Paper text:
The cryo-EM structure of MmpL5 is nearly identical to that of MmpL4. Superimposition of these 2 structures gives rise to an RMSD of 0.9 Å (for 681 Cα atoms). However, cryo-EM densities for the majority of residues making up the periplasmic subdomain PD3 are missing, similar to what was seen with MmpL4. Distinct from MmpL4, the structure of MmpL5 indicates that this transporter only possesses one channel that spans the outer leaflet of the transmembrane domain up through the periplasmic domain. In MmpL5, the section of TM8 located at the outermost surface of the cytoplasmic membrane shifts into the core of the membrane protein by as much as 3.5 Å in relation to the position of TM8 in MmpL4. In MmpL5, the narrowest region of the channel is surrounded by residues Y417, Y767, Q771, and W835, residues that may be important for controlling the width of the MmpL5 channel. Similar to MmpL4, residue D278 and Y852 of MmpL5 interact with each other and create a hydrogen bond, presumably relaying protons for energy coupling. Autodock Vina suggests that MmpL5 binds Mbt in the transmembrane pocket and periplasmic cavity with affinities of −7.9 and −8.0 kcal/mol, which correspond to KDs of 1.6 and 1.3 μm, respectively.
These membrane proteins belong to a subfamily of the resistance-nodulation cell division (RND) superfamily of transporters and are critical for mycobacterial physiology and pathogenesis, with several of these transporters involved in the export of fatty acids and lipid components to the cell envelope. According to the protein sequence alignment with MmpL3, it is speculated that both MmpL4 and MmpL5 are proton motive force (PMF)-dependent transporters that function via a proton/substrate antiport mechanism.
Numbering used by the authors: 22 to 494, 693 to 945
């Protein structure tokens, strides 16, 4: 009277294993490697409706210069002040850049014209910079290719002695970030596998069992990689560095956890005295639903990213869910098949300890005897991490999160050695009318607008037609001058319908004060256009500061939406499986409390020890994984409690603690260490995400699963399983 599903998985184990291996091999061989697919299918990091991107694109369209939103700055640095040779080299480089229309779309030559030459040259005179609008939006593969082409054009040429060109900028930073993440993914995988091997040898103390678990992990990881790369290659969805790295790490960790659960339950059945066939059937009956529910929870939590606004999270959503589904399918079908096939030979999967752990029994007895005090202590420990909130802050520049030898970092270092960050991050503001503004009164009004913008606090320079370098030059004889005509061509649209101001903020515009300055600039422009024929003009404001403001707004909204959706979906899944509202609520609440400790530990590790503030993407990525895995562990505990409750509530809790003590502890340690192994990446954002998830899962395994959940269960008693009667 064996159930049909485990019987089928056991009788046809060899065909199932062969089919899984063949499918995974086909997926990997037919389509290129995941790194190449991610490079080809990289997506822009800014939403198409972002105000900054729209403003920059509108400026490009109006002036008939470009249709992109990505600009890289080429900085010429010299050991001696630049002169005739440097100018000739710069002119040749500009001509070559303009020749390559495939990648370069516009070159804002300001050092060339004597009208704005002083603006583009450093105070010491040993350096200069030129902005280049390149094809493709920041982040996508076309932008990376354009950055590489610009860098090749600038560096690979005959340069004057002591003069070097560096291609810095936000687009270059994103390209180098993607390159570093893709490069470090291999090292992440290697270190993760080494850590997993060490942990498995420690847990099982058997080389054969470790090899079996490693084989299952390799199968699951390879399947997830193959399907993700296959779908990405055929343009089903976009991919990012974070998406690929998290797919790989989560696949490895989830496969290892599922294998640990199955093998631990099988070995517990063996220790109970059941034969190998009966042990396998007991293992399946006791862990198949738990593994399926845990995988569905992880997949749904990851899929919740798909309903965000920022392109990175949204593009990360679907691939993670698909990969988790593949890992679960492999674990529930190839898992038991491998276990049966292996256990049919010698003393392979038979346990070596053949003894119980008095520590877990003692912990269970203590938790049952004194639930209130243990619960209070666990809650206090979880909420201690809230102390990191007052000191918590984030930065948006990615220079800190990349290695110094990175070309973008070298360019930024040279620029900051010779220029200020405000100049390297100018803010563009276009005022567009439906008439021609090439009349002296309109120029007076434009100068008034520029003065209004300068009056705003933290506004260092306002370059425009009336202020080519920020210093004002108005008879028509001024118009008759050729330099004024060139300035009009540079700062006004070909038809004269629009005028663009370049605003350099005092200090650093990439701050909260910078956002306030942006808002005040919009207000000042609106005030200036009042009462003038410019009243109907539309105002667009783009740049690095506006882009980072949009990123901040999107990050906040995405964090809120992701947290809410993940909580609701996980609660629904746990309610469906456990058939108890109170149990699911307890699981979700305990993991939510663990989240605060996770955040506190991560902030303490990175801000106050390493010295690098958490990236603006770490928390939304880490929240879903922490919630899913903590819910899975509490689900294991609750499921075993439901199985053992027939002997009594407290006796059932103690038996659940004993049975699922070592297995879930080993699984949690393995998952936490696999996540923490991402810290080896050169990209520091991925390391922060991995360390945050690892710390959170360590706290959940040590405190939440062991103490908080059993204490809450004991205190609730019969009400823990409401509404179903016990």
């Amino acid at each position: 009277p064996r159930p049909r599903l485990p019987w089928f998985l056991r009788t046809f184990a060899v065909p199932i294993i062969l089919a899984w291996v063949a499918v995974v091999a086909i997926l990997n061989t037919v389509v290129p490697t995941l790194d190449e697919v991610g490079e080809m299918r990289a997506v822009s990091m800014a939403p198409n409706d972002a105000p900054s991107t729209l403003a920059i694109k509108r400026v490009g369209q109006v002036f008939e210069e470009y249709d992109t939103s990505s600009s890289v700055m080429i900085v010429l640095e010299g050991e001696e002040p630049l002169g005739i040779e440097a100018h000739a080299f710069y002119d040749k480089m500009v001509a070559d850049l303009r020749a390559d229309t495939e990648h370069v779309q516009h070159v804002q030559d300001f050092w060339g014209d004597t009208l704005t030459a002083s603006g583009a040259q450093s105070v010491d005179g040993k350096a200069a910079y030129v902005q280049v609008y390149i094809a493709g939006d920041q982040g996508e593969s076309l932008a990376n290719e354009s950055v590489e082409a610009v860098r090749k054009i600038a560096t690979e040429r005959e340069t004057p002695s002591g003069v070097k060109a560096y291609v810095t900028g936000a687009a270059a930073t994103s390209a180098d970030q993607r390159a570093e993440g893709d490069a470090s993914m291999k090292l992440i995988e290697g270190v993760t596998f080494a850590v997993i091997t060490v942990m498995l040898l420690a847990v099982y103390r058997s080389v054969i069992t470790t090899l079996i678990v490693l084989a299952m992990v390799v199968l699951g990881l390879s399947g997830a990689r193959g399907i993700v790369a296959f779908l990405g290659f055929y343009n089903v969805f976009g991919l990012t560095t974070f998406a690929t790295n998290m797919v790989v790490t989560l696949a490895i960790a989830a496969a290892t956890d599922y294998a640990i659960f199955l093998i631990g339950r099988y070995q517990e059945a063996r220790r109970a005295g059941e034969d190998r066939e009966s042990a396998y059937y007991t293992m399946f009956h006791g862990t198949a639903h738990v593994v399926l529910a845990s995988g569905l929870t992880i997949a749904g939590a990851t899929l919740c990213l798909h309903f965000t606004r920022l392109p990175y999270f949204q593009t990360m959503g679907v691939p993670l869910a698909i990969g988790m589904l593949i890992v679960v399918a492999a674990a529930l079908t190839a898992g038991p098949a491998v276990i049966s096939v292996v256990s049919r030979f010698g003393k392979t999967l038979e346990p070596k300890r053949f003894s119980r752990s008095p520590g877990w029994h003692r912990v269970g007895t203590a938790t049952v005897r004194w639930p209130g005090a243990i619960l209070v202590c666990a809650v206090v420990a979880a909420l201690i991490g809230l102390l990191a909130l007052p000191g918590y802050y984030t930065t948006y520049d990615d220079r800190r999160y990349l290695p110094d030898d990175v070309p973008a970092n070298v360019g930024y270092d040279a620029a900051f050695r010779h220029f200020s960050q405000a100049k390297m991050n100018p803010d563009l503001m276009m005022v567009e009318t439906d008439r021609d503004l090439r009349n002296p009164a309109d120029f007076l009004v434009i100068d008034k607008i520029a003065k209004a913008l300068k009056n705003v606090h933290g506004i260092a320079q306002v370059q425009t037609i009336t202020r080519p370098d920020g210093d004002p030059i108005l008879p028509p004889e001024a118009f008759e001058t050729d330099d004024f005509q060139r300035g009009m061509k540079l700062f006004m649209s070909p038809d004269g319908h629009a005028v663009r101001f370049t605003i350099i903020h005092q200090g650093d515009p990439l701050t909260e004060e910078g956002t306030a300055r942006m808002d005040e600039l919009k207000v000042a422009a609106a005030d200036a256009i009042k009462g003038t024929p410019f009243e109907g003009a539309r105002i667009y404001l783009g740049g690095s500061a506006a882009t980072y403001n949009d990123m901040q707004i999107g990050a906040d909204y995405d964090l809120i939406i992701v947290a809410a959706s993940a909580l609701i979906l996980i609660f629904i899944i746990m309610m469906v499986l456990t058939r108890a509202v109170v149990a699911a609520a307890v699981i979700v609440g305990t993991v939510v409390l663990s989240l605060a400790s996770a955040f506190g530990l991560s902030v303490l590790l990175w801000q106050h020890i390493v010295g690098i503030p958490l990236h603006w993407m770490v928390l939304p990525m880490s929240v879903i994984v922490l919630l899913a895995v903590g819910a899975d562990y509490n689900l294991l505990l609750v499921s075993r409690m439901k199985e053992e409750i027939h002997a009594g509530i407290r006796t059932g809790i103690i038996r659940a603690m004993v049975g699922t003590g070592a297995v879930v502890t080993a699984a949690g340690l393995v998952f936490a260490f696999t996540m923490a192994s991402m810290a080896v990446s050169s990209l520091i954002t991925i390391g922060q995400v991995g360390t945050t998830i690892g710390l959170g899962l360590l706290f959940d395994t040590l405190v939440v699963r062991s103490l908080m959940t059993p204490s809450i269960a004991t205190l609730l008693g019969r009400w823990f399983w409401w509404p179903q009667r016990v």
